[PDB]
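Box 3.1. Reading complex inputs
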Amino acid sequence: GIVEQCCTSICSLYQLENYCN
Amino acid sequence: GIVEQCCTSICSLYQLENYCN
Amino acid sequence: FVNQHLCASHLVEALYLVCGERGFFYTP
Amino acid sequence: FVNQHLCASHLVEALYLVCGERGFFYTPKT
């Protein structure tokens, strides 16, 4: 999820944005 | 994230692909 | 009527297919 | 160099920003 993609690893804006809704 | 997006709701290929890595 | 939702094992299987050798993280 | 990992409160604050009026589900465990 968001913690693995953006915290453990480094995410792009679009990856982060894929979490909205 | 992926469940709300693809399971509760319906997701597109690029949404699914954005969870890879 | 036909179901477009991807849940549980069907979701993991969909990630296994689209991600291919990139791999993926998953937690239920 | 800025630390590029987004964690904890910084991560929630980033979602708040980029999602805007769409809003978001924050679900840290999965």
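In summary: The two ends of chain A are 14 Å apart (CA to CA).
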